[PDB]
Amino acid sequence: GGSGGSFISRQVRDAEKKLGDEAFGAKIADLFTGLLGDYNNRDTSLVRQRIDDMLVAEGELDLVFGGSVAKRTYVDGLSDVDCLVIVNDTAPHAARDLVAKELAAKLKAEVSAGKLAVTVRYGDGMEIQLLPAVRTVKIPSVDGRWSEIDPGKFQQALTKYNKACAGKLVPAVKLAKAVIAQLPDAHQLSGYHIESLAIDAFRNYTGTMTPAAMLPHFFEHAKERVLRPMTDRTGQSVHVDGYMGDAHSDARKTASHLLGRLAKRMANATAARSLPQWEDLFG
Amino acid sequence: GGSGGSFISRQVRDAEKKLGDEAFGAKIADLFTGLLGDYNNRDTSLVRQRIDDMLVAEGELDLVFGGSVAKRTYVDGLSDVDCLVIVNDTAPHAARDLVAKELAAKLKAEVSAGKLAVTVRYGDGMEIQLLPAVRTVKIPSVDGRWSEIDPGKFQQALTKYNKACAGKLVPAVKLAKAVIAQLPDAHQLSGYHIESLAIDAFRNYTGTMTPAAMLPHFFEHAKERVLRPMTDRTGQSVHVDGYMGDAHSDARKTASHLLGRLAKRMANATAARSLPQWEDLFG
Amino acid sequence: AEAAVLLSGGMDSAACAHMLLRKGYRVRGLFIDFGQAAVAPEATAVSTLANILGIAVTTISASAPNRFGSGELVGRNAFLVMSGIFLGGAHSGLIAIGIHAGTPYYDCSPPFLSRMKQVAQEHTSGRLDVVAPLLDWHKPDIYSYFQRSGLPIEATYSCESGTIPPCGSCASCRDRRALGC
Amino acid sequence: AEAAVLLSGGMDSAACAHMLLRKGYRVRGLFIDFGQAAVAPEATAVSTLANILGIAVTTISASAPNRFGSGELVGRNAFLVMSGIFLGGAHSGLIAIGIHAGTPYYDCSPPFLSRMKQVAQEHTSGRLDVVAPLLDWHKPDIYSYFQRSGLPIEATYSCESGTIPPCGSCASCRDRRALGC
Numbered sequence: 001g002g003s004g005g006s007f008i009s010r011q012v013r014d015a016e017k018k019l020g021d022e023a024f025g026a027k028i029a030d031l032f033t034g035l036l037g038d039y040n041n042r043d044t045s046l047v048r049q050r051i052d053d054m055l056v057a058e059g060e061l062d063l064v065f066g067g068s069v070a071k072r073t074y075v076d077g078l079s080d081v082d083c084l085v086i087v088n089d090t091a092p093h094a095a096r097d098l099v100a101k102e103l104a105a106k107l108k109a110e111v112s113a114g115k116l117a118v119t120v121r122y123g124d125g126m127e128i129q130l131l132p133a134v135r136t137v138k139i140p141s142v143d144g145r146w147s148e149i150d151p152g153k154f155q156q157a158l159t160k161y162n163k164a165c166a167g168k169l170v171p172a173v174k175l176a177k178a179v180i181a182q183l184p185d186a187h188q189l190s191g192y193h194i195e196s197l198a199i200d201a202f203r204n205y206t207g208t209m210t211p212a213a214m215l216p217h218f219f220e221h222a223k224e225r226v227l228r229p230m231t232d233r234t235g236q237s238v239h240v241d242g243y244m245g246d247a248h249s250d251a252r253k254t255a256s257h258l259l260g261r262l263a264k265r266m267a268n269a270t271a272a273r274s275l276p277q278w279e280d281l282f283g
Numbered sequence: 284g285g286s287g288g289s290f291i292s293r294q295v296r297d298a299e300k301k302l303g304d305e306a307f308g309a310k311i312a313d314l315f316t317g318l319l320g321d322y323n324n325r326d327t328s329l330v331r332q333r334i335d336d337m338l339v340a341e342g343e344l345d346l347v348f349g350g351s352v353a354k355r356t357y358v359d360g361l362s363d364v365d366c367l368v369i370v371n372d373t374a375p376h377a378a379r380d381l382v383a384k385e386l387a388a389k390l391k392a393e394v395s396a397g398k399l400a401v402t403v404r405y406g407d408g409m410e411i412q413l414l415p416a417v418r419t420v421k422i423p424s425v426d427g428r429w430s431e432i433d434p435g436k437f438q439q440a441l442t443k444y445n446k447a448c449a450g451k452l453v454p455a456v457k458l459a460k461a462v463i464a465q466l467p468d469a470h471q472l473s474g475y476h477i478e479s480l481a482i483d484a485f486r487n488y489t490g491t492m493t494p495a496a497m498l499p500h501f502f503e504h505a506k507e508r509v510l511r512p513m514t515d516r517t518g519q520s521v522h523v524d525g526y527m528g529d530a531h532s533d534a535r536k537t538a539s540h541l542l543g544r545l546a547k548r549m550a551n552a553t554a555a556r557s558l559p560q561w562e563d564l565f566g
Numbered sequence: 567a568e569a570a571v572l573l574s575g576g577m578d579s580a581a582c583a584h585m586l587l588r589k590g591y592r593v594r595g596l597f598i599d600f601g602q603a604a605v606a607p608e609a610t611a612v613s614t615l616a617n618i619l620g621i622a623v624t625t626i627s628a629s630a631p632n633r634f635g636s637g638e639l640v641g642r643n644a645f646l647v648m649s650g651i652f653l654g655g656a657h658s659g660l661i662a663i664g665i666h667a668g669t670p671y672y673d674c675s676p677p678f679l680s681r682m683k684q685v686a687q688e689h690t691s692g693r694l695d696v697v698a699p700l701l702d703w704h705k706p707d708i709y710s711y712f713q714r715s716g717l718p719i720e721a722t723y724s725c726e727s728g729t730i731p732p733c734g735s736c737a738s739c740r741d742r743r744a745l746g747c
Numbered sequence: 748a749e750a751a752v753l754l755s756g757g758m759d760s761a762a763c764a765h766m767l768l769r770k771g772y773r774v775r776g777l778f779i780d781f782g783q784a785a786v787a788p789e790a791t792a793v794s795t796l797a798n799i800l801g802i803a804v805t806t807i808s809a810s811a812p813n814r815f816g817s818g819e820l821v822g823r824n825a826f827l828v829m830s831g832i833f834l835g836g837a838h839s840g841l842i843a844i845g846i847h848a849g850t851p852y853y854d855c856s857p858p859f860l861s862r863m864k865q866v867a868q869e870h871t872s873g874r875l876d877v878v879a880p881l882l883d884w885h886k887p888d889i890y891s892y893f894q895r896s897g898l899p900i901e902a903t904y905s906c907e908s909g910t911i912p913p914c915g916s917c918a919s920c921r922d923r924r925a926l927g928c
């Protein structure tokens with residue numbers, strides 16, 4: 001504490017102003033924590049066991065990312081599913097109906113089908129999300145159309161960099177998907193593309209490892225990274241954003257403006273200490 | 284510690300290998316600490332008092348950066364001097380001789396003159412470094428030639444960003460000057476230019492705030508920043524590297540290769556766990 | 567918002583507690599007895615200042631073979647913050663430390679605060695933040711605020727030697743001497 | 748190089764101390780008594796393991812109004828590191844913690860280690876570094892190394908409930924059950 005003799009209204013106002021910002025930051029963190037409550041409290045041990053109980057074959061992809069956040073009950077990426085269920089019939093909307101029927105018999109639980117996945121709701125309320133896959137492995141999504149991404153490499157990157165982020169990458173991705181889900185459907189990036197952008201955004205992340213700090217970082221990073229086709233560190237493409245075109249296309253520019261406006265709204269909401277503006281971002 | 288049932292020769296070798304690197308890092312830190320001993324142990328309170336005792340007029344620049352490091356007994360930047368002594372005669376090698384004569388009479392201490400500054404050695408061994416200045420304020424350096432930099436703005440930036448680095452910026456600069464001083468004289472950047480590069484390198488520094496970690500960061504940053512003329516955040520030039528030419532000149536390219544080779548030698552010495560190679564970098 | 571203030575008995579942390587109370591926050595205090603030489607006069611000062619401010623203080627004790635005296639104690643301020651979190655129950659809101667500028671200590675510097683902020687935030691998903699309102703202030707500024715606080719200077723104690731009367735030569739005593747305090 | 752190992756009585760920290768001793772480092776131990784429920788069996792395990800390894804252990808005590816039980820205690824591991832530095836005299840060399848992968852705890856994660864490394868380095872100009880050799884290991888890997896260590900499994904204790912026999916349901920007991928230990 002001592003300086004050894006080594007030597008106000010503005011300073012007082014500046015100090016109170018900063019304290020206000022620091023208090024608001026903790027308040028928004030509670031908002032994010034509540035939004036992430038179902039994911040963070042999910043009994044992943046029970047999800048893994050029940051996957052073995054219900055299970056034409058399950059993929060070797062360890063995901064268990066099925067907890068919903070921010071009331072967004074959508075499944076559009078690997079970070080939203082619990083496991084892939086590879087269909088063995090050599091024949092996307094159809095392979096989902098297979099997985100739905102076979103499990104309805106094996107199960108104890110009511111099985112349902114959605115826009116992209118199969119939801120097994122057990123008696124206690126647990127909803128496990130199963131993505132139907134086909135072997136050639138590919139995953140759905142553009143309805144009635146299979147995706148081109150490699151499901152294994154996405155799972156490897158998601159888990160590795162989620163582990164490198166103390167399991168906070170997927171919470172940040174789920175909050176980002178909640179922010180983007182409130183935009184027009186045609187002005188929304190794909191769930192797989194968001195996950196690839198988050199991998200690229202957090203591989204060399206030096207900032208604070210909290211969802212509150214990571215979420216603005218994703219949109220700040222992705223508004224630039226979306227301008228160029230997605231690649232890994234080798235430079236090899238990951239084949240997730242071919243639907244946007246070539247580098248600096250009009251589509252990628254339009255996505256850059258939107259990703260930048262969501263980031264500005266986040267900064268403005270925090271600077272305005274506006275809790276309702278932050279809640280409006282999540283719906 | 285517990286994982287709740289959530290579940291080697293290569294792993295053992297990798298662990299021992301990393302422990303070796305972590306132990307070497309602490310060893311190099313002791314090397315840097317010893318090299319910085321005279322600066323870190325200097326009685327700055329006594330330096331400030333003795334400056335008032337000996338003192339045609341002293342500048343209002345609070346510096347007290349006069350402690351030598353790594354046996355480099357050179358003075359070539361503001362981060363090497365304790366105070367500016369503005370000469371009042373309206374008439375660089377000459378203004379130094381004024382300050383040398385006037386203080387030799389006022390002093391208790393033996394006064395000496397060097398390549399750029401005036402060294403007042405008190406009876407107890409304290410060497411205070413006084414840079415002669417002239418009013419038009421300018422500082423020397425290219426001998427017999429005054430510099431074009433604004434001495435006030437350099438002092439403001441050095442102190443502000445030294446404070447933002449817990450007083451570690453100047454130790455890092457002094458270690459960097461020690462590394463560069465072992466190169467050929469014609470292949471050495473100016474002391475003022477090194478200080479401006481360090482300001483630009485550490486203004487937005489997110490890494491570990493130790494001289495051991497900051498020193499490779501400076502050379503990694505400066506090998507790119509030296510390619511373009513130095514500016515502040517406004518973009519206004521600081522007028523310190525006009526001697527190198529325009530952006531991406533042959534001179535700046537030659538300095539970039541050298542700054543990059545010193546950084547590679549630092550990385551190689553650390554990877555080789557070579558204490559003598561690190562000591563050879565400081566002479 | 568809730569605020570836990572690390573209190574040492576000096577003007578700095580008292581000024582912090584007054585500021586947080588003046589902002590309307592729910593404020594409580596934390597005193598750490600780690601065997602420091604001044605534990606007895608510091609504790610008395612903390613009890614008096616807290617009783618005036620109307621805040622409760624949790625006393626956290628720690629002991630190990632040491633001879634703590636004056637001057638820098640490596641890791642002290644980061645240990646005080648981590649003690650307030652782990653042992654003082656400061657898991658949400660703000661935890662305040664009265665560090666300021668002008669000292670020779672790294673753990674009073676802005677880089678120290680930025681790291682402590684990250685540590686606290688990352689352990690609580692941001693629900694807890696470390697705050698130091700006087701970070702860039704010097705002691706004469708703090709003394710001015712303390713004179714506006716209404717708190718009694720006679721009840722404060724800052725000598726790192728623990729002697730009554732104060733030793734007069736430690737860094738904190740020389741702060742008081744340079745301020746006529 | 749000197750190494751201070753935070754010892755808890757489990758296989759993980761014992762494996763760390765064995766590794767550092769096997770690298771030729773000068774090793775000493777640190778046990779923190781903060782009122783945890785398992786302080787008595789943990790302390791006994793630490794005394795026995797340290798006596799076998801031939802290392803001295805400094806016991807650091809801390810107390811505050813708490814009811815520490817099983818499960819996550821917010822800020823524990825960062826408090827153990829800061830206790831080892833400030834109260835255990837670990838100011839240079841290495842300070843080791845036996846955190847590993849597979850746990851639900853943030854303060855066992857790589858981001859926790861990177862921040863603790865920065866904190867320790869910045870407080871000591873890099874002369875001290877935090878190390879966790881088992882960071883990316885899972886408990887079966889640690890159990891394999893412990894079987895190569897020559898240390899007795901019967902002398903280890905890891906139940907977070909402090910009961911003898913162990914509770915069987917805490918995360919550490921279920922680790923032992925899944926390993927037949």
Ligand SMILES: Nc1ncnc2c1ncn2[C@@H]1O[C@H](COP(=O)(O)O)[C@@H](O)[C@H]1O
Binds near residue numbers: 157
């Ligand atoms: N941005 C990304 N999106 C999807 N997959 C990726 C991305 N970056 C890397 N991968 C894949 O993830 C795996 C791990 O990559 P890395 O950890 O970067 O070596 C490899 O199979 C990569 O091809």
Ligand SMILES: Nc1ncnc2c1ncn2[C@@H]1O[C@H](COP(=O)(O)O)[C@@H](O)[C@H]1O
Binds near residue numbers: 479480514515516
């Ligand atoms: N790289 C640099 N070298 C020398 N002076 C600088 C540099 N950057 C900024 N300054 C000056 O330092 C003062 C503080 O700048 P800033 O803190 O960047 O606003 C101003 O007078 C700037 O012109």
Ligand SMILES: Nc1ncnc2c1ncn2[C@@H]1O[C@H](CO)[C@@H](O)[C@H]1O
Binds near residue numbers: 001596646
């Ligand atoms: N014993 C202590 N208990 C609690 N906080 C302390 C203690 N000593 C110092 N501090 C905190 O550290 C700051 C700098 O000394 C003080 O203003 C106070 O916030």
Ligand SMILES: Nc1ncnc2c1ncn2[C@@H]1O[C@H](CO)[C@@H](O)[C@H]1O
Binds near residue numbers: 754846
């Ligand atoms: N009471 C304790 N004292 C010292 N270190 C501890 C204690 N409890 C846990 N640890 C450290 O934390 C790690 C994870 O539990 C252990 O391997 C050990 O290094």
Ligand SMILES: [Zn+2]
Binds near residue numbers: 734737738
């Ligand atoms: Zn004193």
Ligand SMILES: [Zn+2]
Binds near residue numbers: 907909918
């Ligand atoms: Zn148990």
